[PDB]
Design a protein around this nucleic acid. Structure first.
Lengths: 119, 172, 117, 171, 106
RNA sequence: GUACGUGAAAUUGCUGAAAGGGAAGCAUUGGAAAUCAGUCUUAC
RNA sequence: UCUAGUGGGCCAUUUUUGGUAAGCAGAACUGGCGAUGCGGGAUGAACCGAACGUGAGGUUAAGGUGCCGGAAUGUACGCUCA
RNA sequence: AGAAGCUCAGACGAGUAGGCAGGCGUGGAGGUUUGUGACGAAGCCUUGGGCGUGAGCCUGGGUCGAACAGCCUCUAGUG
């Protein structure tokens, strides 16, 4: 079923997919890499995590297989407002067991957002 | 660990197998040889080789003869001559190293000024120890070229090519 | 890997210099007697797949980045994780207000702007 | 309507325009090229001389079949004519430009023809009847003329720096 | 004034070419006194340059130089092939070049 | 400015530059002259 | 399995017929040109060599090295005076 | 690891008539993009820059004044 979703949305129309002439960018509000791919596909992965920026505050999102039918409680929010290091250990801790290799990607994403926040 | 990691997994270069081995200089560039400088500000000067450094030759035509201080000169920019050898066994050559001739580190794009050019110069910059070393090597080198005739003024002169001279036929 | 261009001059259409009705845009000569089609020595060359550039350095600017067209701030944030691969290029129809907003967005991201000035 | 040239700044210049003037564009161009650059007063003297056949307008571009004359030698040419219709139009415009300079407060002694250009005006067209029941064009080539009168008209390397210092300053 | 000229005088003869096709990347150079390929072997790898004069002052210099290296002998009459950092202009056919004595091995 | 939105090309005049001993255009390579971007400056 | 174009050819090697002969007409075998650039034969559709993605270096083919023109006004032995 | 992706190796590359494949461009339709726009859309001019083997595409400056575009599909009086 998760593969059905990817075969429907990945290669064709998707509101978070931005195809230009040779490449795919994924702006989806719950992705980390920024690119379109099942491994990183937020909608087609039932267990997946992300970080995004908001008003000087970092946010980590997670979602599971249990709450798929209820979009309202489907995604889970946590807020971060501390320095980078501690913000790193939070993602490390929150993901040392959950995604598999998203730990490094969201460390990279948290990196870029904190440079945004200082600027 | 670190702060603000790059968003790109760094590409470490493959382990190179290029081992540095000592340079085998030309068999005719023995210490004490009279050589001809081909490039640089002292092109055409005749100099006396002191020692062979890692890549170049630590060389000076006696500063009281032709005014060429102690310099490194790359071995590809000298024509070694067949002139009689000068005794350079009695002069210390261990203190002439890459560190000795090394320039001051800059690591920045800012440079150049009229006062900068007014700086350096022989009057400034030039250490008293460097002057003393030049005088000491002069004291140890002049007696040999005084003893063998015509070599003092030979070192003073400047090499030049004339009409009809063909360097492949000519030997030095 | 530095960028190498197999060819720098454009492939201009044959006889576009002599006739104004014939444009510079490359057209393949279909003529039965065409000197350029038959590849006579001294005639203009034709586009060939051998002229294609290295896949690693293709579409790359001399600085190594790829100019990705940008029309609003959300277009800039798409380059958040690819600021050493792409360079923002503000579209020509974007007004001055969003042009300033995109520039400050891109400078915050650390994304280079090809036409910032 | 704006003029062709960067001058016509009204602080130190004058200009005058003529449009749809029914005279030959080729003759007007030759007159304009001849008078371009001479002083306004001497331009008037030349134009009266052309009207009186004392001087001739050299024909340089549109010279096909134009006869030879001795009055072209001061321009180093053999073909020259005396187009009086074109010269009359140019005289009227130059008088208008001089009047504009007068009202603007310029100096008549120092004025020169800084810019003069002739452009082709739309053709009015007429009919001429040929042999074998054929009709063709009897076109007229008018000219737009515009005139503007006005007044008057390293880093050095380290080795290079050291060489320069030790040679110049030391001696 | 004969206390200088640490170079050997040479002349740019032509590009390397067939009967009808030229190859401007490499040039043919006649070094004076070089009359055989055995003599050309001495001049192999030497640093050859084209020195010319311009009105514009680049870095305060009226003299600008294009450098190059002798690559191989050409023919039997002592002519050599030379590769320059910028291909020599075709207007220099018959002009003079300076062949230094470095990189020296003598 | 009614010869009126925008105003292309052919073609034309002016200006600046350049070229030219019975065509011109083109391709290739570099020179000259004009013009211009990248890169850099930093980050660690 | 379905379908395109084609159903005017031409030249050379060798064999051969008609012909006074022909840059003529007709065939056989093969190779080519047509559909093919490149090196060479000054020049040329089929001759010689070689068949072609974009380039760098090296080396050759056919053919050349007095000058035009890249490359010995080379070597050896004669012949030739027009 | 847009598995329609990534990676390794080898051979190879002429072409009219003609066949096939993948792409570029145009008008209109459905969906989509918190899409661009009178703080200048479309169009036009350009000895500016950039990308692509190419069809082309983007951009700086100038002019201009009311609309237009990216992507997925549909379509045709489409070069």
């Amino acid at each position: 079923q998760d593969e059905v979703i990817w075969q429907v949305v990945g290669h064709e129309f998707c509101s978070y997919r931005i195809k230009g002439e040779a490449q795919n960018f994924c702006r989806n509000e719950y992705n980390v890499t920024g690119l379109c791919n099942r491994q990183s596909c937020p909608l087609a992965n039932s267990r997946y995590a992300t970080v995004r920026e908001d008003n000087g505050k970092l946010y980590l999102y997670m979602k599971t297989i249990e709450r798929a039918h209820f979009p309202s409680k489907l995604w889970q929010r946590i807020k971060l407002s501390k320095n980078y290091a501690k913000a790193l250990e939070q993602i490390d801790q929150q993901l040392l067991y959950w995604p598999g290799r998203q730990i490094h990607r969201c460390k990279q994403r948290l990196t870029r957002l904190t440079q945004y926040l200082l600027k | 660990a670190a702060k603000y990691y790059p968003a790109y997994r760094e590409n470490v270069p493959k382990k190179a197998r290029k081992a540095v081995r000592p340079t085998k200089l030309r068999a005719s560039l023995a210490p004490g040889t009279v050589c001809i400088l081909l490039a640089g500000r002292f092109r055409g000067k005749r100099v006396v080789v002191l020692s062979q450094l890692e890549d170049t030759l630590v060389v000076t035509g006696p500063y009281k003869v032709n005014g060429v201080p102690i310099r490194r000169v790359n071995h590809r920019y000298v024509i070694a001559t067949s002139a009689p050898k000068i005794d350079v066994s009695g002069v210390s050559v261990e203190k002439f190293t890459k560190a000795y001739f090394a320039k001051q580190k800059r690591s920045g794009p800012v440079k150049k000024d009229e006062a900068f050019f007014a700086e350096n110069a022989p009057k400034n910059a030039l250490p008293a120890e460097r002057i003393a070393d030049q005088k000491a090597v002069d004291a140890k080198l002049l007696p040999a070229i005084k003893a063998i005739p015509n070599m003092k003024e030979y070192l003073a002169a400047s090499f030049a090519l004339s009409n009809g001279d063909r360097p492949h036929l000519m030997k030095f | 890997v530095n960028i190498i261009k197999k060819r720098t001059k454009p492939f201009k259409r044959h006889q576009s210099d002599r006739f104004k009705r014939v444009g510079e845009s490359w057209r393949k000569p279909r003529g039965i007697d065409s000197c350029v089609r038959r590849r006579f020595r001294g005639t203009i060359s034709m586009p060939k797949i051998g002229y294609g550039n290295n896949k690693k350095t293709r579409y790359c600017m001399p600085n190594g980045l790829k100019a990705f067209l940008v029309r609003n701030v959300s277009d800039v944030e798409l380059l958040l994780m690819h600021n050493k691969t792409y360079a923002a290029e503000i579209a020509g129809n974007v007004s001055a207000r969003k042009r300033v907003e995109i520039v400050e967005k891109a400078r915050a991201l650390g994304v280079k702007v090809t036409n910032a000035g | 309507v704006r003029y062709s040239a960067s001058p016509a700044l009204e602080t130190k210049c004058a200009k005058a325009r003529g449009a749809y003037l029914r005279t030959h564009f080729k003759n007007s161009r030759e007159v304009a090229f001849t008078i371009n650059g001479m002083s306004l007063k001497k331009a008037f003297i030349f134009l009266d001389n052309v009207k009186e056949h004392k001087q001739a307008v050299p024909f340089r571009r549109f010279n096909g079949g134009v006869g030879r004359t001795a009055q072209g030698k001061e321009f180093g040419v053999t073909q020259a004519r005396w187009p009086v219709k074109s010269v009359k139009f140019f005289y009227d415009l130059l008088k208008n430009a001089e009047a504009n300079a007068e009202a603007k407060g310029l100096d008549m002694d120092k004025l020169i023809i800084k810019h003069v250009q002739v452009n082709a005006a739309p053709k009015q067209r007429r009919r001429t009847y040929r042999a074998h029941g054929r009709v063709t064009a009897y076109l007229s080539s008018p000219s737009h003329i515009e005139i503007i009168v006005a007044e008057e008209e390293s880093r050095v390397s380290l080795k290079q720096g050291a060489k320069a210092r030790n040679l110049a300053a030391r001696k | 004034a004969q206390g200088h000229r640490l170079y050997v005088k040479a002349k740019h003869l032509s590009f390397q070419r067939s009967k009808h096709v030229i190859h401007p990347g490499t040039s043919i150079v006649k070094i004076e006194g070089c009359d055989s390929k055995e003599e050309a072997q001495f001049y192999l790898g030497k640093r050859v340059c084209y020195v010319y004069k311009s009105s514009k002052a680049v870095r305060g210099s009226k003299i600008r130089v294009i450098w190059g290296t002798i690559a191989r002998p050409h023919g039997n009459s002592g002519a050599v092939r030379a590769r320059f950092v910028h291909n020599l202009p075709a207007k220099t056919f018959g002009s003079s070049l300076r062949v230094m004595l470095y990189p020296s091995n003598i």
